[PDB]
């Protein structure tokens, strides 16, 4: 059996969102819907086509007929951003099937510049001959940054590794970048800096031995 789900859906706050679950005569099966905000575990939203789990607000409703079942979310708000999976039980073969999941994004979120915190190596780490600089980047939207490191003004390369952006609970993004150096290397420059570029503007933080 197959369950089909569009990879994404976008809607503006207050608007109605529609997530579809297509399957050959899925109308004859009972459909459940799950909401997941990774890395949290999934939460059961709707069972038996249209019965809400306790604590799920009325603005979520389900329907099922023919070859499509639908989860409708009216008055969409930021708290609704999440991945939604449909799921059925096929009693003929005793197999549980899930759709691929649909990521719902709420549009109109204002641009937010990253906040940046940079830490130097700790005494503890240096007495083991190592020096890791840590640049923590938070609360940005959209979820894309570029990070560049510099030592006394000259670009650094490398010893640098940077995470992909990940969505925070407040719907903005976070990332981090690390500069791994030897204790000697760290002591050789007067200044190090982490420069973060977002939507054509940059934010820089500096640390010194």
């Amino acid at each position: 059996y197959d369950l089909t789900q569009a990879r994404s859906v976008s809607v503006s706050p207050g608007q109605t969102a529609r997530v579809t679950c297509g399957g050959d005569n899925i109308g004859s099966k009972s459909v459940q819907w799950y909401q997941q905000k990774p890395p949290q575990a999934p939460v059961l939203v709707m069972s038996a086509d249209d019965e809400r789990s306790s604590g799920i607000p009325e603005r979520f409703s389900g329907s099922n007929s023919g070859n499509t079942a639908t989860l409708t979310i009216s008055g969409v708000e930021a708290g609704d951003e999440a991945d939604y999976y449909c799921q059925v039980w096929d009693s003929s073969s005793h197999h549980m099937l899930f759709g691929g999941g649909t990521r719902l994004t709420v549009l109109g979120q204002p641009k937010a510049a990253p906040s940046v915190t940079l830490f130097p190596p700790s005494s503890e780490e240096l007495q083991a001959n190592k020096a890791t600089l840590v640049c923590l980047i938070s609360d940005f939207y959209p979820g894309a940054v570029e990070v560049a490191w510099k030592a006394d003004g000259s670009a650094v390369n490398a010893g640098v590794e940077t995470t992909k952006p990940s969505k925070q609970s407040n719907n903005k993004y976070a990332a981090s970048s690390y500069l791994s150096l030897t204790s000697d290397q760290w002591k050789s420059h007067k200044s190090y800096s982490c420069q973060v570029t977002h939507e054509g503007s940059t934010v820089e933080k500096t640390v010194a031995p």
Binding site: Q32, Y34, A41, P42, L44, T132, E161, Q168
Partner: protein, 234 residues
Amino acid sequence: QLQLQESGPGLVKPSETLSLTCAVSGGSISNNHWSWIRQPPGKGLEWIGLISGSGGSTDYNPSLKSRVTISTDTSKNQFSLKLSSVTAADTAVYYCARIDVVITSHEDDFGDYYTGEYYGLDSWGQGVVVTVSSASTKGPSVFPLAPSSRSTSESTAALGCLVKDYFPEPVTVSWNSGSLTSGVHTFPAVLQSSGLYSLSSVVTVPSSSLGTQTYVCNVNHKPSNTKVDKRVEI
């Protein structure tokens, strides 16, 4: 209140057997049906199988062939999963859950035979990260991240812990044994060229508290049985 908690080795060698347990509290194993589900990184949910608590009747994802066993243990109020001959395709977060079932009667001669229809999964556990790899387990080193002079001159300041050089995922971090929750931000791990992960966790606190309040980060790395409460000196 039904609470499920998965546990088991986080590192499995390719071709070996994955064994996970789900501890059930707030209710009896025998009074429900129970299921295992997995989710590969950045992918969707996949059903593994289910078992009837008092009945032992099982159903498995057919594509898992004969690699899958699910079992129950009443005396410990647990259920379990075994997945043999694993490969990197079995790397994933594994969840346990309760599945809602309604049993329907149909009178025969004879007599009546029962039918079962399965509904939603609820009471999901937090999930356990399983990595299939030939690399070695390594517990982290934990270092303090101390705010700068300039930063502590602001009204608030971030201090934190760097959890350095561990394998495999994951690590958890709490502050002051969990009594400190507001202002906490744990960043997702970076995978370094050394093959090891590092992550950072920071808590933003009033600069007035710096050097009078004690701040301790509690780091747990289950795969290595590492549990460290590191005092962050200021």
